RNA sequence: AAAAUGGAUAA
RNA sequence: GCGAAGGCCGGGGGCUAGAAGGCGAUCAGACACCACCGUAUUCCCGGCCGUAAACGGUGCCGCCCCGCGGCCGGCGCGCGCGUCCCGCCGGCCGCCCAGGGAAACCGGGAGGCUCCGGGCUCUGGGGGGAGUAUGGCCGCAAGGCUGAAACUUGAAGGCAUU
């Protein structure tokens, strides 16, 4: 049975959000170089470097398909921004509501303007 | 049986002023409960009062400016010796400087200060602060 | 640094005088702020009862020490806060820190004769903590502070020197006896009188949180 | 405004839940055939314009912070926080964000704006501890505790939360005179939707 | 809504119990019935709990009820 | 209005004086946390601008817990007039 | 201490309830302190689900179902696991699971 | 299904 | 005056359970628990007795007291016209805002108290001895009600946390 220690999981998350492009989904060794590449990251001992490498290859799989939270990617923030800042091509929601609710008519009558009284109705 | 009109009515005033309740209601009214209220309004502890004269028990309206703490009645209504009005003051008064104990004297419903100015004694009706 | 928004304002002096902060009821969580706001004799202090507290677990019983500290100045200010730590002295230090945050303004009062400057208590201020029920009753000029030896000295640091007390409950408990009195001494400003009933102030732009250095 | 009243009726903001309290009866208008309550939109405008009025009081709008844990909402708050100068505090509330001198998210807001008390009660509770006046926008069932003011609104649809947040922000900026001044709003009503 | 007990909205007093009103008094009133020979007012107790008889007839105009008394013939509202 | 306790001379001698709740007149407590001096802003309307200076309402800590702070506000600014009836 | 406000019974406004006996113990516990869980089951075990219906000559005959209320005593029930010892917080919740 | 006991005195 | 159950008196009954009694197994011993048998009893009518964890371990009337409720009994007003909706009173209840308390927690009070005072009634004063002794009284009895002292001892005891 294998479950990763917190030290491996925490560092691995940093290595997957520090470089997603550089890391590989299945090639453990490409990730292993990035894990122990001096300035990019340092793992004391090869076995720990191997431990992070196995997870960063699985985490690379996770980021590639439907990523779990807690990981940041340059593309992820920008790609999300386009969808959130996309307003409907033209907001057709307002239109003319029609079909008045039963007592809503009185509330408009009691505020000084009739919302197309008996036209939406 | 409603044994005392004043006690419940004074508890109800106090109850409203803890819940804020700017407008307060007293249901059974007696002359003494009116005389207590004029004494309170004149002091300014309560802003004003009125009574709707329904042809039964005359309900009372109470308006409180909201500056009220505790207003309770002292019954059994012990008559107090004129010399020792102060002993009752020690127990029922927050500070000798402020507060009021309404007594009943022949001259008319009078507060603690008026009584010692006239050096007179009377049955304790209640304390309003 | 100054950790709180109030703490920076205190060091800056944008809001000055402890009495002003109390007026706006701003929570004070910085120990350093009280020492800066008041350097007068710092604060006079007392270590009221460092009780022994125990938890029986498995093989042996853990023994923390719980201490209650009275810190105060005779300018209508009393501080009662407590702390418990395994080290006996460290508990006292943690208590002093707590005692600084919960310093409570005491109104102070003038008795039947306003002959001079306030030494009396305001009204018969009463507070209960735990079971100990205590009322501070205003007393004549020659009457000093009558209360339990420990409760009375809490009153002296508070600055009242004319008070009468009748505490009822398990008074042997230093923890809640000197704690119930603290509730009474703080209650001094919560109470109201006819002069205080007058509606004024509402300056609005004087909010401590609104003020920016 | 008749076109905003048409928009408010379009948002279904005039809908309510099952019951009201003594305070909420003031904003209540009527009973539908099924039985949920409905609100008079006159009450909606006074509360939202009052909220606009009260919102300019604190300099540094980050101090007038916004907190929400409602799935339909949060986005509207995240649009208001952008259009105004406020800071959103959404998702898990992190109880003790407002307190705790060393809190990762130390927060000391001067005024507070919520999506509603029931959705996250910790938010309104955290007003009492930190000396902060608090505002929320609630449906017919209203636990109005700690909240200076509350505004009747459906809070059931993303669209309803969106149009009251649009109306609030449009009024907040217009009341300031910063933009619009009752003219067509710089952003559309649909922008705040989730 | 800053209504105070001194002036309560009429509907409030009409909704509450006739003793729990700021001004207590009669819930009931007089409601007319119609009889043979009458297009005019034939007043009767609204809450009659006893038999009233057709003027100069054997049949009973109002059915007995714990509440407002019901009728079997044409009837006229309150006082007219 | 000479608010506050005084000596025979009549100067205020009670040091700090706590402010009063607008709706209940209760003194905002020395360590009371919920009670706040929040500010309400008036508008030019023709100006459509904040004028920098406006009124403040103190909501008592007790009323906040009681829940009536909202219904108290409509009345507080109804007498002031800024909020409608 | 009062572990529960109902005091262990649903007796409300009466002061007396008719007493029955545990199906198992035969202990007499008043109707209010009784488990009483209604049972409806196929008379042959569902293991003989359709083996019987395939054997049954008559067309459209449904396996008879018992509809019996089982009334157990409080003591018998906890030891037969019909209800367990809940936590202080858990006790207030009802919502038959 | 069957199971009883444990000196005092401090620790 | 009434008062569960058990008891008891004089008639009846007599199915079932079943104080006692026997019996098996049960263990060191069980004369206990678990089976089996079974008298009193259970049942009935006229009597006594007078007790209960007779409980909400919360006297009795009185009044104010915050929301969400469920049930229940009348009793209304509008809706489409339903065994609807809002409720008005008398209860039955669950959650609980204040507020109280050592707390568990009550909150339609165990809230409106040391900022103590609506009225009437009972009852207690560390823990044993002690409901004991005696003096009554009531009862066929069994027993009930009232009710000691000498003497001893430092804890007894409530709710909580580990």
Author numbering:
A (entry chain SU): 2 to 122
B (entry chain SJ): 2 to 130
C (entry chain SB): 28 to 240
D (entry chain SA): 16 to 209
E (entry chain Se): 44 to 123
F (entry chain SY): 4 to 88
G (entry chain Sd): 2 to 98
From the reporting publication:
Giardia intestinalis is a protozoan parasite that causes diarrhea in humans. The highly compact and uniquely GC-rich Giardia ribosomes possess eukaryotic rRNAs and ribosomal proteins, but retain some bacterial features. Using single-particle cryo-electron microscopy, we have determined high-resolution structures of six naturally populated translocation intermediates, from ribosomes isolated directly from actively growing Giardia cells. The translocation intermediates, with naturally bound tRNAs and eukaryotic elongation factor 2 (eEF2), display characteristic ribosomal intersubunit rotation and small subunit’s head swiveling—universal for translocation.
Unrotated state C (structure C-III) and rotated/ratcheted state D (structures D-I and D-II) represent PRE-T substrates differing in their SSU and tRNA conformations. State C contains tRNAs in the classical A (A/A), P (P/P) and E (E/E) states similar to previous bacterial or eukaryotic classical PRE-T complexes. The tRNAs are stabilized through canonical interactions from the A, P or E sites. The acceptor arm of the A-site tRNA is at the PTC. Clear density is seen for mRNA with the monitoring bases A1410 and A1411 sampling the minor groove between the codon and anticodon of the A-site tRNA. The third monitoring base G457 and A1744 of helix 69 (A1913 in E. coli and A2256 in S. cerevisiae) were seen interacting with the codon–anticodon pairs. To understand whether Giardia ribosomes exhibit subunit rolling, we compared the classical PRE-T state ‘C’ with the POST-T state ‘A-I’. A clear 4.6° rotation of the SSU toward the A site could be observed in transition from the POST-T to the PRE-T state, along with formation of the B6 and B8 bridges. We observed ‘subunit rolling’-specific narrowing of the A site by ∼6 Å in the PRE-T state, similar to the earlier report in human ribosomes (∼5 Å).
